[PDB]
Design a binder for this molecule. Structure first.
Ligand SMILES: [Fe+3]
Ligand SMILES: [Fe+3]
Length: 286
């Protein structure tokens, strides 16, 4: 009942409570699609690229208002759909609904919050327990475990949630990551979901999060030259303007949840990539 699900999702802090069976159907069908597509996506422009949402469903609707509801635009999201916000269920369900309906034009990457042990702590487990049951949360977890990890747009823009890894020598190493899997505490898959650029680090550094690493501008420059890429597009950190460049525009951080978690006064942004690989930004003020 996909059109009916999308309809009720779009009709609207006002909740949308679908049925358990409908939500379970969303997870099972999307999971099949994820596993049928590569773990390293190879995408083509034109595309719109969005950073973190964190359950801010009303802002997700804003993004589609600005960018165009599918299938008017093509979409890549970079992860972190759930936790912290008040409407993770609505958020993730519309995302999974669009993935099933437009599976060659709608793409979702895995963020560090699409991991059971993080969800457990940061709100999604609780929202699932309250509104449905724990068994549903476990169904979401199995779906999350099948999400792809990175994307390359037109052989030039490398996309992932977190950032680079000292263990990332070849793109093939990403392709050999096996799904379903949980995100480990260390290593390539961890770093792709958890690392941060840092202006004050040279090479690889300790990350204040207590997970993964920080990397400096020369690590980015080297990565891009080696792999013949032009840009790293990532998310994972709140930034005042919704996007923010690093390493002389060789990396961009995107963040798509304006007025993040009520605490910050940030804009959200969405990046458009056109057929000539020109990048522009649409800005969503809080
Ligand atoms: Fe996040
Ligand atoms: Fe994150």
């Amino acid at each position: 009942n996909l059109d009916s699900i999308i309809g009720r999702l779009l009709e609207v802090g006002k909740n949308v409570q679908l049925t358990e069976n409908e939500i379970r159907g969303l997870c099972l069908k999307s999971r099949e699609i994820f596993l049928s597509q590569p773990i390293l996506l190879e995408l083509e422009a034109p595309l719109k690229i969005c950073g973190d949402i964190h359950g801010q469903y009303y802002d997700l609707l804003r993004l589609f208002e600005y960018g165009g509801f599918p299938p008017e635009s093509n979409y890549l999201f970079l992860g972190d759909y759930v936790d912290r916000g008040k409407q993770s269920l609505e958020t993730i369900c519309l995302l999974l609904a669009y993935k099933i309906k437009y599976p060659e034009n709608f793409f979702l990457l895995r963020g560090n919050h699409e991991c059971a042990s993080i969800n457990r702590i940061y709100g999604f487990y609780d929202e699932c327990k309250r509104r449905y049951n724990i068994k549903l949360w476990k169904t979401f977890t199995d779906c999350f475990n099948c999400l792809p990890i990175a994307a390359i747009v037109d052989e030039k823009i490398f996309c992932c949630h977190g950032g680079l890894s000292p263990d990332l020598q070849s793109m093939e190493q990403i392709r050999r990551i096996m799904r379903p899997t949980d995100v480990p505490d260390q290593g390539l898959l961890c770093d792709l979901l958890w690392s941060d650029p840092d202006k004050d680090v040279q090479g690889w550094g300790e990350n204040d999060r207590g997970v993964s690493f920080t990397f400096g501008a020369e690590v980015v420059a080297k990565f891009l030259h080696k792999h013949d890429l032009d840009l790293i597009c990532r998310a994972h950190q709140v930034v005042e303007d919704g996007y923010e460049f690093f390493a002389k525009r060789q990396l961009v951080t995107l963040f798509s949840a304006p007025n993040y978690c009520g605490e910050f006064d940030n804009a959200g942004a969405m990046m458009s990539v056109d057929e000539t690989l020109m990048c522009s930004f649409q800005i969503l003020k809080p």
